[PDB]
Design an enzyme around this catalytic site. Structure first.
Site, PDB file in Angstrom:
ATOM      1  N   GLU A   1       0.862  -1.170   0.124  1.00  0.00           N
ATOM      2  CA  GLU A   1      -0.020   0.173   0.130  1.00  0.00           C
ATOM      3  C   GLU A   1       0.673   1.219   0.028  1.00  0.00           C
ATOM      4  O   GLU A   1       0.361   2.370  -0.352  1.00  0.00           O
ATOM      5  CB  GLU A   1      -0.820   0.098   1.106  1.00  0.00           C
ATOM      6  CG  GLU A   1      -1.867  -1.090   1.077  1.00  0.00           C
ATOM      7  CD  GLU A   1      -3.177  -1.031   0.313  1.00  0.00           C
ATOM      8  OE1 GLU A   1      -3.034   0.145  -0.445  1.00  0.00           O
ATOM      9  OE2 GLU A   1      -3.865  -1.876   0.163  1.00  0.00           O
TER      10      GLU A   1
ATOM     11  N   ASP B   1      -6.272   6.534  -4.649  1.00  0.00           N
ATOM     12  CA  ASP B   1      -5.670   5.215  -4.919  1.00  0.00           C
ATOM     13  C   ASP B   1      -5.691   4.546  -6.282  1.00  0.00           C
ATOM     14  O   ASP B   1      -6.258   5.479  -7.238  1.00  0.00           O
ATOM     15  CB  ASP B   1      -6.671   4.102  -3.910  1.00  0.00           C
ATOM     16  CG  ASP B   1      -7.833   3.935  -4.407  1.00  0.00           C
ATOM     17  OD1 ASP B   1      -8.441   4.199  -5.493  1.00  0.00           O
ATOM     18  OD2 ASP B   1      -8.428   2.852  -3.630  1.00  0.00           O
TER      19      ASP B   1
ATOM     20  N   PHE C   1      -8.348  -6.808   3.233  1.00  0.00           N
ATOM     21  CA  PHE C   1      -7.832  -5.188   3.342  1.00  0.00           C
ATOM     22  C   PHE C   1      -7.816  -4.392   2.210  1.00  0.00           C
ATOM     23  O   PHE C   1      -8.498  -3.326   2.059  1.00  0.00           O
ATOM     24  CB  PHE C   1      -6.234  -5.111   4.093  1.00  0.00           C
ATOM     25  CG  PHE C   1      -6.085  -3.842   4.394  1.00  0.00           C
ATOM     26  CD1 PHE C   1      -5.572  -2.957   3.499  1.00  0.00           C
ATOM     27  CD2 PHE C   1      -5.857  -3.330   5.466  1.00  0.00           C
ATOM     28  CE1 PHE C   1      -5.106  -1.962   3.731  1.00  0.00           C
ATOM     29  CE2 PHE C   1      -5.253  -2.335   5.997  1.00  0.00           C
ATOM     30  CZ  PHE C   1      -4.812  -1.524   4.911  1.00  0.00           C
TER      31      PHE C   1
ATOM     32  N   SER D   1     -12.724 -20.397  -5.552  1.00  0.00           N
ATOM     33  CA  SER D   1     -11.131 -19.989  -4.897  1.00  0.00           C
ATOM     34  C   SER D   1     -11.341 -20.336  -3.229  1.00  0.00           C
ATOM     35  O   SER D   1     -10.454 -20.966  -2.956  1.00  0.00           O
ATOM     36  CB  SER D   1     -10.896 -18.538  -5.085  1.00  0.00           C
ATOM     37  OG  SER D   1     -10.453 -18.154  -6.420  1.00  0.00           O
TER      38      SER D   1
ATOM     39  N   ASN E   1      -7.467 -19.795 -10.283  1.00  0.00           N
ATOM     40  CA  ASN E   1      -8.627 -19.510 -10.140  1.00  0.00           C
ATOM     41  C   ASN E   1      -8.738 -17.990  -9.749  1.00  0.00           C
ATOM     42  O   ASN E   1      -9.378 -17.175 -10.126  1.00  0.00           O
ATOM     43  CB  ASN E   1      -9.603 -20.189  -9.196  1.00  0.00           C
ATOM     44  CG  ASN E   1     -11.220 -19.893  -9.404  1.00  0.00           C
ATOM     45  OD1 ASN E   1     -11.859 -19.073  -8.348  1.00  0.00           O
ATOM     46  ND2 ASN E   1     -11.556 -20.670 -10.259  1.00  0.00           N
TER      47      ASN E   1
END
Ligand SMILES: CCCCCc1ccccc1
Length: 165
Positions: A11, A20, A104, A117, A132
């Protein structure tokens, strides 16, 4: 490595409001302020989150406090989610960090999309899970980060993160 180091790499750290990868106002280590196009709305959310008039800028200590709150929230969110908790509990420690990283980044709204998944991860079918997981808007829009997270699920090691210090 631990979940904080991993997400700090993914991040980054910015002390001023920024947009972002999706164009949303964010600050610190990936702390989403609002999906509203209004910088003023973001500034209000920031002031409410920090508890003072920041005028769009925070200190490193403040960024780290939001980050601790956000990691804690991601983990608690997994433990509260009836679809995620059993998968998370089935995983080893490194793979649990990959799960926290995904929650997150994306929250829990798209969990139903990742049903297949999650099943492969619960079954420890790591290569199939990895294939996947990459069939996703997530992978296509943030491929370098998705690849690191997927490699972490595939191998149960921190190799994708040591590589790039
Ligand atoms: C939006 C769905 C993220 C799911 C990530 C995950 C994977 C395994 C265990 C818990 C959470």
């Amino acid at each position: 490595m631990n979940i904080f180091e991993m997400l700090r790499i993914d991040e980054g750290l910015r002390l001023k409001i920024y947009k972002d990868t999706e164009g949303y106002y964010t600050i610190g280590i990936g702390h989403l302020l609002t999906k509203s196009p209004s910088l003023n709305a973001a500034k209000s959310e920031l002031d409410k989150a920090i508890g003072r008039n920041c005028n769009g800028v925070i200190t490193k200590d403040e960024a780290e406090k939001l980050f601790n709150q956000d990691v804690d929230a991601a983990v608690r969110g997994i433990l509260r989610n009836a679809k995620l908790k059993p998968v998370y509990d089935s995983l080893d420690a490194v793979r649990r960090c990959a799960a926290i990283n995904m929650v997150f980044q994306m929250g829990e709204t798209g969990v139903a999309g990742f049903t297949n998944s999650l099943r492969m991860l619960q079954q420890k079918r790591w290569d199939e899970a990895a294939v996947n997981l990459a069939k996703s808007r997530w992978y296509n829009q943030t491929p370098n980060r998705a690849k690191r997270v997927i490699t972490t699920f595939r191998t149960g090691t921190w190799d994708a993160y040591k590589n790039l210090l």
